Write an enzyme that holds these catalytic residues in place. Sequence first.
Site, PDB file in Angstrom:
ATOM      1  N   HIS A   1     -15.006 -10.282 -44.370  1.00 24.03           N
ATOM      2  CA  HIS A   1     -14.382  -9.840 -45.606  1.00 24.03           C
ATOM      3  C   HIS A   1     -14.848 -10.683 -46.792  1.00 24.03           C
ATOM      4  CE1 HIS A   1     -10.647  -8.667 -42.973  1.00 24.03           C
ATOM      5  NE2 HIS A   1     -11.713  -7.940 -42.694  1.00 24.03           N
TER       6      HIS A   1
ATOM      7  N   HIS B   1      -4.438  -4.648 -32.405  1.00 27.42           N
ATOM      8  CA  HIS B   1      -5.717  -4.586 -33.097  1.00 27.42           C
ATOM      9  C   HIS B   1      -6.602  -3.556 -32.405  1.00 27.42           C
ATOM     10  CE1 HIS B   1      -9.766  -5.728 -34.577  1.00 27.42           C
ATOM     11  NE2 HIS B   1      -9.092  -6.018 -35.679  1.00 27.42           N
TER      12      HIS B   1
HETATM   13  C1  LIG Z   1     -10.971  -8.762 -36.209  1.00 28.00           C
HETATM   14  S1  LIG Z   1     -12.184  -8.097 -35.374  1.00 28.00           S
HETATM   15  C2  LIG Z   1     -11.286  -9.307 -37.535  1.00 28.00           C
HETATM   16  C3  LIG Z   1     -12.423  -8.790 -38.126  1.00 28.00           C
HETATM   17  C4  LIG Z   1     -12.820  -9.258 -39.372  1.00 28.00           C
HETATM   18  C5  LIG Z   1     -14.075  -8.753 -39.900  1.00 28.00           C
HETATM   19  O1  LIG Z   1     -14.472  -9.000 -41.044  1.00 28.00           O
HETATM   20  S2  LIG Z   1     -15.052  -7.938 -38.678  1.00 28.00           S
HETATM   21  C6  LIG Z   1     -12.043 -10.217 -40.018  1.00 28.00           C
HETATM   22  N1  LIG Z   1     -10.937 -10.669 -39.448  1.00 28.00           N
HETATM   23  C7  LIG Z   1     -10.201 -11.690 -40.184  1.00 28.00           C
HETATM   24  O2  LIG Z   1     -10.209 -12.866 -39.333  1.00 28.00           O
HETATM   25  C8  LIG Z   1      -8.909 -13.499 -39.324  1.00 28.00           C
HETATM   26  C9  LIG Z   1      -8.273 -13.435 -37.932  1.00 28.00           C
HETATM   27  O3  LIG Z   1      -8.131 -12.071 -37.569  1.00 28.00           O
HETATM   28  P1  LIG Z   1      -6.759 -11.561 -36.891  1.00 28.00           P
HETATM   29  O4  LIG Z   1      -7.116 -10.110 -36.371  1.00 28.00           O
HETATM   30  O5  LIG Z   1      -5.621 -11.481 -37.993  1.00 28.00           O
HETATM   31  O6  LIG Z   1      -6.365 -12.413 -35.742  1.00 28.00           O
HETATM   32  C10 LIG Z   1      -8.071 -12.735 -40.372  1.00 28.00           C
HETATM   33  O7  LIG Z   1      -8.155 -13.417 -41.637  1.00 28.00           O
HETATM   34  C11 LIG Z   1      -8.718 -11.343 -40.433  1.00 28.00           C
HETATM   35  O8  LIG Z   1      -8.555 -10.736 -41.724  1.00 28.00           O
HETATM   36  C12 LIG Z   1     -10.520 -10.259 -38.246  1.00 28.00           C
END
Ligand SMILES: *C(=S)c1cc(C(=O)S)c[n+]([C@@H]2O[C@H](COP(=O)(O)O)[C@@H](O)[C@H]2O)c1
Length: 425
Positions: free
Chosen positions: A105, A171
Amino acid sequence: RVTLDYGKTGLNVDLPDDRTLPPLTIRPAPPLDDPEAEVVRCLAEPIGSPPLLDLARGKRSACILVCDITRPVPNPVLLRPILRTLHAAGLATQDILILVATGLHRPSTPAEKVEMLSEEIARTYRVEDHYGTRLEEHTYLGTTPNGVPAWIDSRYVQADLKIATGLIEPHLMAGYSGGRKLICPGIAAFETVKLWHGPRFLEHPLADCGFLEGNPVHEENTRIARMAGCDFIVNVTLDGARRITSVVAGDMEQAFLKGVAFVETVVKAAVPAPVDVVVTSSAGHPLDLTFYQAVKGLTGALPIVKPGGTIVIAAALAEGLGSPEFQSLFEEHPTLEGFMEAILKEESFTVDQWQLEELAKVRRKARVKFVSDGVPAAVLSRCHVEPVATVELAVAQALEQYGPEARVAVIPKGPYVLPVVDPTL
Ligand SMILES: *C(=S)c1cc(C(=O)S)c[n+]([C@@H]2O[C@H](COP(=O)(O)O)[C@@H](O)[C@H]2O)c1
Ligand code: NI
């Protein structure tokens, strides 16, 4: 009448009385009266770990991973006890880094850091963002047996004490968020994530909400996270009103799995049979900021929609479609079929393409009607969904094509519910 999650406000919808099942909601577990006091107790008596104070003895630097704006973690509730404990252990505030685990992100803004962390913490501690497309900011830790190279942010890898905070929710790829996911993908480079979010992983039938054992996505990010290490996690679960219902702290795998064991007892909501029309949300603010994230409400509804049925989703989309790379894929591939041809037959990797792959998974099973005032209808119509002015109109339209026996299911909290079909009902 039902209130769907929608931006900061919700959205009041009136659904047909004789067609609509009771809304699917998570089970009403008791909120913790004093979650911060509970975090304090868990840091003194954690799962599978020495107490945080004892881990931090003698440590010279620390890196604390926090989620970005898209996860509604009540970070100050978790962080104030951690930061007090680190101060007690002798670490100076200048020795502590708070690293926003963006994955791929965009970085968090200054105002977002204040809303995530509180003004006191954002003004006192160094708070920096992960940049997944900057390989020079990452350290190589090895390659997994599946051939995925592990590239993890160097500020975390080099810190004496590694801490991660987060939120356990369903998720659509990794089964549940939380634990290990703060490391992979939270602070992993595109060189890692493009393969871990590639079709060889995401087309697996168990790469889906609620699956951990047997889900290769979860097996692989657990392995990658363990090659980086993590000394201590603190994770929470939230109910529908965003109150904390559990705290787990300690070992990155054991505490996570204890949190999952609890969340599995409240997130499932069953229907007796799949239905022709599913009304859902993208869980409101902050998840529903972009169409990129709102795909999660669509994949979340899949288990209870009949093949050829219709998902009606409401999402505020206050920030629009998503990243420039994500938006460019809609111009490069006017059909989902051509997109899938491109990425399935060659090693073709574009930032954020995995959510277009998830949307393709949705549209192989169901039609989508999309209700939003955050993106114009003209734009949404080129995103492989049908824009409809209101949820009530979208439901009336869908009920017309499916006939008099068609039923409606509604999921007000969208992807924070795990809808399932239970024939025994
Ligand atoms: C899950 S696959 C995931 C994917 C992304 C991508 O950009 S791809 C980003 N995030 C971010 O990572 C942190 C942890 O994820 P969680 O699913 O909340 O445990 C969090 O800041 C997500 O925004 C996750
Ligand atoms: Ni991801």
